[PDB]
Design a protein around this nucleic acid. Structure first.
Lengths: 177, 168
RNA sequence: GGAUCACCUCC
């Protein structure tokens, strides 16, 4: 309680209803791995989707609460736990774009995904970032350079650029190395 | 180096005597303060140990400060609920800012004494609370720090604040 | 290929 009052860091988020299952995992294994891997304590409300992430006496990484929180959001925005675990690497961040802020929605989703997900895969390969398209958002994991490349390409597709120029754009940015 | 009259501080009870206690101030390393028995509670205190234990952490008000002699007096009774709550929020935000700054230092290869001298001190002087500096940078861009800290800190402070501090 | 994809599913 001394510790509770003077040191505990706590974060609160809310993930969509049908991702709750995924966050928990079979026998709670997924939540337990996040907890284990970040030395945090995660509390999930099965009805409302509210999640609480807090530090513990055991917590060793000062930024861990925030990393755990981000993995929770990534899972919430369509990433699988395996893919969300990328956020434990140094200097990799999660960025959530609201499609509705750019733009018809279902159509833009399909332009980002591409036939058989070819567009998503090319964006991931060329930017180096991980991309999840889900509901009204597209979420990207990577370092800021990787994020800015994927972000730009995704925005181009939303604003109506033909696929060709997007790939050429990606081709251009990679060539800057 | 010393807190101000009227400032709320986090402190640790180090010694208890019959008519008072000595506390070390957590945010002013090695600085000791006195707390008279009459400042421990709003009711009459018969035994201090009913209210204080060696090692206990406390939010307390600074009621008297003499910097030439290095005397500091504290009071526990004068702190209101709201004041306790605020100070505790403010203390937790100072732990974040410090962790954010340690991370920026590691990224840039500067030791912590430098980070303190080049970033912490000047930001504290100007915004009053380092976390607040970061909150401004998050809302209006890292450029708000330009001038207060060496330019080489901006790119990395930028990456860290943008990803970790919400705009209020 | 010529624009909807794959993996993860109640502690």
């Amino acid at each position: 309680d001394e510790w509770e009052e003077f040191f505990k860091q706590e974060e609160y988020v809310k993930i969509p209803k049908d991702r709750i299952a995924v966050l928990i995992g079979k026998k709670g294994q997924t939540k337990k791995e996040i907890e284990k891997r970040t030395k945090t304590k995660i509390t999930i409300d099965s009805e409302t989707g509210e999640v609480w992430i807090t530090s513990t006496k055991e917590t060793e990484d000062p930024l861990a609460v925030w990393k755990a929180r981000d993995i929770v959001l990534a899972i919430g925005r369509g990433f699988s736990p395996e893919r969300a675990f990328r956020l434990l690497n140094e200097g990799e961040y999660l960025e959530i774009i609201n499609l509705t802020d750019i733009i018809a929605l279902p159509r833009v989703r399909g332009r980002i995904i591409g036939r058989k997900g070819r567009t998503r895969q090319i964006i991931e390969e060329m930017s180096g970032a991980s991309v999840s398209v889900y509901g009204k958002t597209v979420a990207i994991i990577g370092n800021p350079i990787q994020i800015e490349i994927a972000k730009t390409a995704i925005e181009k597709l939303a604003r109506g650029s033909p696929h060709g120029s997007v790939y050429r754009y990606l081709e251009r940015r990679k060539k800057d190395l | 180096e010393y807190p101000e009259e009227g400032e709320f501080v986090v402190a640790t009870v180090k010694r208890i005597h019959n008519y008072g206690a000595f506390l070390e101030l957590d945010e002013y390393p090695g600085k000791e303060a006195f707390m008279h028995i009459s400042e421990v509670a709003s009711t009459w205190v018969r035994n201090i140990r009913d209210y204080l234990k060696e090692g206990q952490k406390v939010v307390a008000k600074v009621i008297r400060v003499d910097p030439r002699k290095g005397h500091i007096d504290l009071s526990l009774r004068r702190v209101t609920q709201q004041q306790r709550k605020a100070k505790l929020q403010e203390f937790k935000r100072a732990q974040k800012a410090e962790n954010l700054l340690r991370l920026a230092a590691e990224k840039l290869g500067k030791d912590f004494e430098a980070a303190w001298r080049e970033v912490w001190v000047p930001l504290e002087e100007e915004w009053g609370e380092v976390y607040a500096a970061f909150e401004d940078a998050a809302k209006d861009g890292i450029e708000v720090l330009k001038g207060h800290v060496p330019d080489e800190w901006l790119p990395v402070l930028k990456e860290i604040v943008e990803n970790y501090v919400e705009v209020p």
